[PDB]
Amino acid sequence: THKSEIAHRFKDLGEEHFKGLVLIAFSQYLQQCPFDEHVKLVNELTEFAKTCVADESHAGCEKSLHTLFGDELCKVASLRETYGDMADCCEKQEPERNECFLSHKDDSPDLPKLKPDPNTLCDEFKADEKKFWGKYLYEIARRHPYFYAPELLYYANKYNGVFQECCQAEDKGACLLPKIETMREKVLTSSARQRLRCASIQKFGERALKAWSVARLSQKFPKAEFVEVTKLVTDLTKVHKECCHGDLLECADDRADLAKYICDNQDTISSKLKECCDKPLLEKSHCIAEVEKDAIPENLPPLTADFAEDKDVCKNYQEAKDAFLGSFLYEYSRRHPEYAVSVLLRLAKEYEATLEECCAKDDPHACYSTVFDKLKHLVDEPQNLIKQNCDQFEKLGEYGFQNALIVRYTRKVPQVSTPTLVEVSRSLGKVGTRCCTKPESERMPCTEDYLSLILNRLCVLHEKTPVSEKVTKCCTESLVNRRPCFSALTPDETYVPKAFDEKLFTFHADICTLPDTEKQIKKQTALVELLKHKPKATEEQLKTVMENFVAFVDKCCAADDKEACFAVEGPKLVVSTQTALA
Ligand SMILES: O=C(O)c1cc(I)cc(I)c1O
Ligand SMILES: O=C(O)c1cc(I)cc(I)c1O
Ligand SMILES: O=C(O)c1cc(I)cc(I)c1O
Ligand SMILES: O=C(O)c1cc(I)cc(I)c1O
Ligand SMILES: [Ca+2]
Numbered sequence: 001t002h003k004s005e006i007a008h009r010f011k012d013l014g015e016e017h018f019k020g021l022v023l024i025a026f027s028q029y030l031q032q033c034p035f036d037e038h039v040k041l042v043n044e045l046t047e048f049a050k051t052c053v054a055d056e057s058h059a060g061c062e063k064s065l066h067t068l069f070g071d072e073l074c075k076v077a078s079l080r081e082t083y084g085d086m087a088d089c090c091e092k093q094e095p096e097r098n099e100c101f102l103s104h105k106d107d108s109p110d111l112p113k114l115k116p117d118p119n120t121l122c123d124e125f126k127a128d129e130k131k132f133w134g135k136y137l138y139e140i141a142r143r144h145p146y147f148y149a150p151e152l153l154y155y156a157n158k159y160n161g162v163f164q165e166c167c168q169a170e171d172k173g174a175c176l177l178p179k180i181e182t183m184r185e186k187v188l189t190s191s192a193r194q195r196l197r198c199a200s201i202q203k204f205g206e207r208a209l210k211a212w213s214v215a216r217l218s219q220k221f222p223k224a225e226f227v228e229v230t231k232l233v234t235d236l237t238k239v240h241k242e243c244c245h246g247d248l249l250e251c252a253d254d255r256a257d258l259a260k261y262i263c264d265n266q267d268t269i270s271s272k273l274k275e276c277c278d279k280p281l282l283e284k285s286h287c288i289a290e291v292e293k294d295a296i297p298e299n300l301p302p303l304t305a306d307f308a309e310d311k312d313v314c315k316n317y318q319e320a321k322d323a324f325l326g327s328f329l330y331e332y333s334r335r336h337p338e339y340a341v342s343v344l345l346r347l348a349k350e351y352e353a354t355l356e357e358c359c360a361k362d363d364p365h366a367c368y369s370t371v372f373d374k375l376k377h378l379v380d381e382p383q384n385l386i387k388q389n390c391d392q393f394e395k396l397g398e399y400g401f402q403n404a405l406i407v408r409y410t411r412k413v414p415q416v417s418t419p420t421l422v423e424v425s426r427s428l429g430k431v432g433t434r435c436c437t438k439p440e441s442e443r444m445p446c447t448e449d450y451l452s453l454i455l456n457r458l459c460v461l462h463e464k465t466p467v468s469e470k471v472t473k474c475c476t477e478s479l480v481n482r483r484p485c486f487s488a489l490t491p492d493e494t495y496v497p498k499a500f501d502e503k504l505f506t507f508h509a510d511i512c513t514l515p516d517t518e519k520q521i522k523k524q525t526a527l528v529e530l531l532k533h534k535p536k537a538t539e540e541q542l543k544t545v546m547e548n549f550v551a552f553v554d555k556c557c558a559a560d561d562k563e564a565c566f567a568v569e570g571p572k573l574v575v576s577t578q579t580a581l582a
């Protein structure tokens with residue numbers, strides 16, 4: 001019995017989750033407002049839902065969630081003061097009003113860094129568990145306004161489980177701290193991934209997210225029929241769409257239905273689902289996401305048969321380009337759980353091009369007969385790139401490898417801003433640690449997938465106020481060729497070196513008194529600057545400059561009166577460095 005969307009969401013999801021989803025919505029839309037105020041919004045909106053559960057015909061209950069929510073945003077008194085043109089949105093009609101609001105969501109918000117102090121935290125948690133859960137929802141959402149919401153609730157539960165276990169113990173910090181750092185990695189990954197999903201939707205169509213999904217599921221569910229994989233992909237894709245347009249109640253609902261659909265059909269999807277399908281809802285959906293792949297069906301025809309050798313290939317393609325191509329991507333991926341989905345979509349796109357050309361020619365079959373070998377370079381390229389880069393990772397270690405990446409990338413695209421260059425090169429530096437030690441069967445999936453993620457963060461940060469047409473080009477050409485494209489950029493000698501700014505290379509006694517993250521960043525920032533100033537420095541010249549810098553920092557940190565020391569050796573470094581790079 002459903003004619004009120006908000007009555008329906010509230011009945012299906014239940015009050016606790018409803019409130020969590022609503023809090024998240026607001027925290028993602030108004031990233032600057034106090035936690036209190038957001039709680040008040042969530043409570044008025046939840047009472048209005050209750051009134052609707054009670055009478056589904058009460059005035060307003062027929063209104064979509066975007067309508068009701070947007071209406072709540074439009075009542076915030078501090079709205080124009082705190083967010084400006086975001087308040088122009090109020091003069092639009094739905095869906096435009098929600099598109100313009102979406103468009104103000106800040107991807108790199110100027111916010112204090114989260115640094116946990118176990119006593120205050122353990123105390124707050126004992127005082128009020130729900131409210132604790134809630135500020136978690138809040139701060140994380142504030143920092144990731146596109147966080148996949150039902151998954152953020154899952155993490156808020158685990159967060160709670162960790163605090164419930166550890167606060168009991170004697171050494172809180174030693175219990176809390178490792179667990180919180182591990183989870184912080186997992187949250188940052190999660191965040192990245194959903195940002196890529198939304199941005200892909202927003203820039204390349206739903207069709208791209210769909211293709212990716214066919215590839216992913218066809219990998220996990222190699223036995224499932226193309227029809228089943230198709231249905232899964234449709235529902236799952238709709239889920240991502242609702243979450244990317246900010247309708248969280250609906251995304252969480254459709255997701256709960258998907259997990260019900262899956263746990264109810266294991267027999268035609270996968271034998272690896274027995275475990276997952278016995279957990280409570282959030283845990284269940286999460287487990288379904290990360291599930292181990294099932295066995296590949298034992299005797300399978302070669303791909304060559306139906307896609308290169310058959311005589312009707314062109315005819316079949318021509319009757320249903322999409323189903324034919326969908327079938328290609330499905331059939332390739334169920335056989336290769338060891339290729340990265342990025343590679344798989346590249347193979348598929350190559351296949352489409354090959355066909356678009358050959359099916360037009362006088363004798364198509366000879367043109368398409370030999371396509372698979374033409375497909376070979378798309379697998380060879382990134383196998384090689386991986387081997388090569390992990391070596392560099394072996395000797396240098398994380399931070400050495402990051403310095404190489406900062407060098408590479410700064411030469412590559414120097415019109416790009418220092419903070420982004422830095423953030424992105426560091427993150428790229430994490431790929432070796434995350435992947436290189438891996439047994440070969442994962443290594444390509446592991447690296448390519450991670451890089452799409454980091455390169456998407458580059459695009460999203462660059463799209464905002466674009467400075468490198470080179471970047472814009474790599475980011476917006478094809479979603480799937482981002483990596484190769486970026487790998488393919490060579491440095492530019494038209495690039496006129498940037499004028500010398502003393503401000504950029506003056507260092508003070510504060511650097512000794514920095515959390516290490518801030519140390520490495522201050523340095524890495526300096527390195528990026530130097531390379532925008534001296535585009536053509538060489539690897540040895542740069543290594544030496546580095547040696548001089550670390551000697552200098554160590555020296556001045558070590559004296560009991562350091563400000564004098566920096567005040568004196570600092571310009572000595574500048575001189576020396578300018579002489580070396582003269
Ligand atoms: O991302 C954070 O800022 C963050 C902060 C805390 I405290 C705990 C976890 I898990 C996080 O992911
Ligand atoms: O990404 C998800 O949230 C997700 C959720 C469900 I339920 C099932 C699969 I396969 C997924 O990939
Ligand atoms: O940075 C790259 O170009 C790169 C590309 C691939 I594919 C794998 C690894 I490890 C990399 O470091
Ligand atoms: O999980 C996904 O469905 C997904 C979708 C896209 I588009 C890109 C990456 I990396 C992903 O992991
Ligand atoms: Ca910003």
Ligand SMILES: [Ca+2]
Nearest residue numbers: 064242247250
């Ligand atoms: Ca909707």
Ligand SMILES: [Ca+2]
Nearest residue numbers: 005242247250
């Ligand atoms: Ca709907």
Ligand SMILES: [Ca+2]
Nearest residue numbers: 012253256257
């Ligand atoms: Ca439902």
